Each structure stands twice: as structure tokens, then as C-alpha cells.
Amino acid sequence: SSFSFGGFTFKRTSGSSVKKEEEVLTGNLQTLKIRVHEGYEEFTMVGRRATAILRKATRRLIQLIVSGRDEQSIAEAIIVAMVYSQEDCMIKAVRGDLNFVNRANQRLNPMHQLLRHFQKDAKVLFQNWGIESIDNVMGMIGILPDMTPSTEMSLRGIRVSK
Ligand SMILES: O=C(O)[C@H]1[C@H]2CC[C@H](CC2)[C@@H]1Nc1nc(-c2c[nH]c3ncc(F)cc23)ncc1F
Numbered sequence: 001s002s003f004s005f006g007g008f009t010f011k012r013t014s015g016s017s018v019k020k021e022e023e024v025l026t027g028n029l030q031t032l033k034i035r036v037h038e039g040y041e042e043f044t045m046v047g048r049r050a051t052a053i054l055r056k057a058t059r060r061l062i063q064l065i066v067s068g069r070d071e072q073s074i075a076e077a078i079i080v081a082m083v084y085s086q087e088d089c090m091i092k093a094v095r096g097d098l099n100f101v102n103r104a105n106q107r108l109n110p111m112h113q114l115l116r117h118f119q120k121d122a123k124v125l126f127q128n129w130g131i132e133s134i135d136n137v138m139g140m141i142g143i144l145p146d147m148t149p150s151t152e153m154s155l156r157g158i159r160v161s162k
């Protein structure tokens with residue numbers, strides 16, 4: 001069965017995961033209690049303006065292949081995938097006001113809290129994610145933290161289908 005996150009419809013296409021609650025420490029030193037998915041899984045992500053295929057494991061993005069209508073729509077998909085990955089570099093990229101601990105009995109979803117944080121401005125997320133050298137795969141291109149294309153380098157695990 002499918003579920004929506006960040007305006008993408010997710011469908012699990014392979015694998016499985018078990019759940020473990022973990023109290024992580026954000027970059028601005030707040031505690032979030034997140035349900036960590038442990039396992040090796042593949043998802044499709046279908047949005048109104050971008051599509052992606054995500055392979056991930058426990059708190060790790062392994063591969064994301066993305067297509068979309070413009071740079072902004074591609075970036076939107078990437079930010080959703082980087083939060084959904086639950087990666088420590090994404091948790092440590094949170095900056096600014098302590099606006100996760102301030103909601104009283106609202107009990108907001110920590111994954112949605114993170115997403116709304118990074119949708120505001122993903123520059124620190126992209127700068128801390130990491131880049132790698134890429135193989136030359138015809139029809140695929142790298143995307144750098146400034147969302148410009150590269151034939152040589154890319155955000156770690158991420159490729160754009162031109
Ligand atoms: O935990 C949640 O409240 C929700 C919100 C935050 C992410 C998902 C979509 C919205 C999550 N829902 C679901 N996640 C997942 C799920 C599998 N592997 C994952 N890895 C990381 C992750 F993060 C969520 C998942 N499966 C079924 C779901 F139905």
C-alpha cells in the first residue's frame with residue numbers, strides 16, 4: 001500500500017524494514033524521537049512535478065534517481081528523499097531557532113518537522129550531505145549542492161535522468 005510524504009506518493013517496490021524508536025540529536029542540539037526504519041528497501045516517489053526511485057537502508061540513502069520538470073521540482077524531490085533517508089548528516093544539518101521543542105501537546109510528526117525545516121532553505125543540508133565522483137552513464141547526470149549539473153561529480157548517491 002502507498003502513502004504520501006512531501007507531496008510524493010511513496011510505494012515500496014522491494015525489501016522490508018523493522019521499526020526502532022531512536023532519540024537523535026539535531027545540529028541545533030534538540031532531541032527528536034524518530035521511528036527509525038531498519039532494513040534494505042526500494043521505493044518509487046511520484047509527485048506532480050518530479051518522479052524518483054529511492055534505494056535506502058538503515059539511516060542511509062544508497063541511490064536516488066530523479067527526473068522532473070525544472071531544477072526547483074528536482075530539488076524538491078531530493079530534499080524529501082534526504083529527510084526520508086533519516087541520515088545522521090541530515091539530522092546534524094538542522095540550524096537556527098529551537099522550533100522542534102516548542103509545540104506543547106500538539107505532538108507533531110518529527111519527520112514532517114524535519115521536512116518543513118529543510119524546505120525553508122536546503123543550502124546547509126546540501127552543503128553537508130557530501131559529493132562524490134560519478135561514472136559516465138549515458139542519459140544520467142550529476143547534480144551539485146548548488147543544484148547545477150555535473151558530468152563528473154554529484155551529491156552522494158543522487159543522479160538526475162536528463
Ligand atoms: O513515520 C511516519 O509517521 C510516516 C511519515 C514520515 C515518513 C513516512 C511517511 C510519513 C512514514 N510512513 C511510512 N514509512 C514507511 C517507511 C519504510 N521505510 C522507511 N524508511 C524511512 C522512513 F522515514 C519511513 C519509512 N513505511 C510505511 C509508512 F506508512
Ligand SMILES: [Cl-]
Nearest residue numbers: 108109112113
Ligand atoms: Cl505534522
